[PDB]
Symmetry: C3
Subunit: 114 residues, 3 copies
């Protein structure tokens, strides 16, 4: 799986260890090996949520399976919790788009996962 | 909707009020409350369109429904119009990817919209 | 088609000519005139792959059709090859998400491709 967070929170407000914590927590939540988890944090963005420039985030999670109603609710609780506790972003100012990728549509190591 | 614009136009050429204008115009265009709308503008990018580094944009619009042939043509006229007027980007150097998201695949406020 | 690369490799390590090379190589690979090809490279990113911040890349390729098992394997060999040669990123630290877009869901020039 891969997780991207885009936020208007400044770079200096992203704590040491944040990418490592995301990696560990995503491994735990998806049950997948941390070796293949990718994470990407993009601070200092020009963004608004509900017309307001208070702290917010727009995120994506891509996974080959492990995407669905109950799973995505669990991921949202986990990820909004992390964004609130580490970046001080209110959960009601976060969107996360979930993508269930077909293995044939994910490239890696000169080939695909199919 | 959530609207993201990535462009090689520099930050100083993005006019004051642009995020709010995008929010207002998308609210009016989708018939939705502005409290739902998220906007994200990413200037100063290293990009090319047709091999040329003249002003261009790569964009995404995500919505839970309200995505379809006629609706997407209307969004494109609106959004290319704003990019032309405000960022001086030719409409034939803009791509907008439209995504019809399922409510179960959009996280918000510790849960999803399902 | 549109190709986006997000990487932790620094801006100075992206060769002059890289966007033009990507455009030409993708034109040849997708069978499309280069006038339609968009490319976007995002260096200096805060990212990790497998918990490590060694060079890595997270990419996307969007196309109206011409996406599938064998085609995507060929794109992955091409694109991982270029990232390895030009940016010195190991192919096993690259993900490429492939998206088969419907023509009605791609805006361009005040309308869509439908
Ligand atoms: C998870 S091991 N990685 C992943 C899943 C889906 C798309 C890209 C990467
Ligand atoms: C477009 S109104 N944005 C949107 C719709 C539904 C849920 C969240 C955001
Ligand atoms: C290639 S003609 N351009 C393209 C394909 C898919 C989505 C956006 C742009």
């Amino acid at each position: 799986p891969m997780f991207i967070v885009n936020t208007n929170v400044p770079r200096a407000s992203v704590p040491d260890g944040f990418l490592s914590e995301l990696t560990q927590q995503l491994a735990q939540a998806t049950g997948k090996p941390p070796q293949y988890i990718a994470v990407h944090v993009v601070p200092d963005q020009l963004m608004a949520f509900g017309g307001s420039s208070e702290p917010c985030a727009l995120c994506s999670l891509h996974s080959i399976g492990k995407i669905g109603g109950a799973q995505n609710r669990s991921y949202s609780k986990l990820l909004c919790g992390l964004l609130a506790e580490r970046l001080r972003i209110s959960p009601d100012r976060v969107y996360i788009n979930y993508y269930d990728m077909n293995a044939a549509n994910v490239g890696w190591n000169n080939s695909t996962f199919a």
